[PDB]
Amino acid sequence: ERPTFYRQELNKTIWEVPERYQNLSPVGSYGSVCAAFDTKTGLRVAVKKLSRPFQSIIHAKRTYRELRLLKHMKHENVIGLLDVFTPARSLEEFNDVYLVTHLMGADLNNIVKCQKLTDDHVQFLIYQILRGLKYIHSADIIHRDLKPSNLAVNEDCELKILDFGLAVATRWYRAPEIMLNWMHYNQTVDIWSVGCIMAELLTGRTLFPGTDHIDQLKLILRLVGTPGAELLKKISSESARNYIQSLTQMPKMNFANVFIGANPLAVDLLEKMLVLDSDKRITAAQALAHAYFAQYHDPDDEPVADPYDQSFESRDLLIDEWKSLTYDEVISFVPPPLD
Numbered sequence: 001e002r003p004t005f006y007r008q009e010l011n012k013t014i015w016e017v018p019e020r021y022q023n024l025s026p027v028g029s030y031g032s033v034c035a036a037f038d039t040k041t042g043l044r045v046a047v048k049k050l051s052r053p054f055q056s057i058i059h060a061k062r063t064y065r066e067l068r069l070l071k072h073m074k075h076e077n078v079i080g081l082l083d084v085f086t087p088a089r090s091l092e093e094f095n096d097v098y099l100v101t102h103l104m105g106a107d108l109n110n111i112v113k114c115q116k117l118t119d120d121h122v123q124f125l126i127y128q129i130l131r132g133l134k135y136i137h138s139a140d141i142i143h144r145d146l147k148p149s150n151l152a153v154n155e156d157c158e159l160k161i162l163d164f165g166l167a168v169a170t171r172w173y174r175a176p177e178i179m180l181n182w183m184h185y186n187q188t189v190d191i192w193s194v195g196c197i198m199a200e201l202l203t204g205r206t207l208f209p210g211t212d213h214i215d216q217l218k219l220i221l222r223l224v225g226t227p228g229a230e231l232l233k234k235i236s237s238e239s240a241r242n243y244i245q246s247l248t249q250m251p252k253m254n255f256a257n258v259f260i261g262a263n264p265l266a267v268d269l270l271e272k273m274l275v276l277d278s279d280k281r282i283t284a285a286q287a288l289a290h291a292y293f294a295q296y297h298d299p300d301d302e303p304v305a306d307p308y309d310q311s312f313e314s315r316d317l318l319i320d321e322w323k324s325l326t327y328d329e330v331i332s333f334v335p336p337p338l339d
């Protein structure tokens, strides 16, 4: 049943992987990642060894979540699972988890930080992000942590959304309703991140380089304008309401003055993505229909996900229960077909 494993000390940490995976070679660091050759498919792959996956209730739930998410993602613009394995023979000695995914050249950070991109490159890159977001959103998953280092791009300019990238602060791409600590935000927090990402591709500069959460807000409202009465009446917290309307009434900027000389269609999408009011923000699906993607948009080739059960998220279990649920998911893994 079980293939032949082999051991080695790879820098900081030890690895025991099946003989199928050769030429392990460190690439960085939640857990650490190696590059490898997969003799079975001929692919270069990344093997990820989780750091102490079952050391607390938090880790154990996180390990389980991650594994369920990856097993479920089957889509061109979303990282998926090639293989998952443990060197453990039984539940009793189950203590280490390894995940295998496609290896990609660089992240989006690595392309913008060194250059600009032309308008046709942003189109295709953002198009692919919105296409993967459409699929993730359709399973009632929200990403929450979209930023350049979470977008992997190969030398063909093909893009995949990663669940956790390699270690530019997270807050620079966070929606204002999450800065303010709103408990009830929706899927379009992710649209907000995309708007920030696109903006950064188009101009080469972080749109909102806040030093902290207050600075961040200050920088956001300075482009988008302080909230009107229609938004203000939907804010449940007295203090947030006070902070907001305690501030100087900044007017909304014309985006065409901030993004001078960019495609006027790109400026239009951005207007629709960077709305302070979350209820009005364009969705991923709608954004795919926007004129700016005219040369790529195909409604018969932008699929949605199967139903994803996340009832587990509300459960409070013992470390050994999460551990055993995670073992079941390893055991039942069906490899995706070659081709």
Ligand SMILES: Nc1ccc2c(NC3CC3)nc(-c3ccccc3)nc2c1
Binding pocket: 176, 177, 180, 181, 182, 183, 227, 231, 234, 235, 236, 237, 240, 276, 277, 278, 279
């Ligand atoms: N329908 C909505 C739309 C936007 C909202 C928003 N956005 C903040 C301007 C960024 N913030 C909040 C909120 C409520 C209580 C505490 C902290 C934040 N609610 C919103 C409800």
Ligand SMILES: O=C1C[C@@H](c2ccc(O)cc2)Oc2cc(O)cc(O)c21
Binding pocket: 033, 046, 047, 048, 079, 099, 100, 101, 102, 103, 104, 105, 106, 107, 149, 152, 153, 162, 163, 164, 165, 166
């Ligand atoms: O190729 C990958 C896969 C990714 C990853 C591997 C395993 C996993 O479970 C989640 C993500 O690590 C990366 C990190 C990067 O900066 C750039 C990359 O191209 C990659």
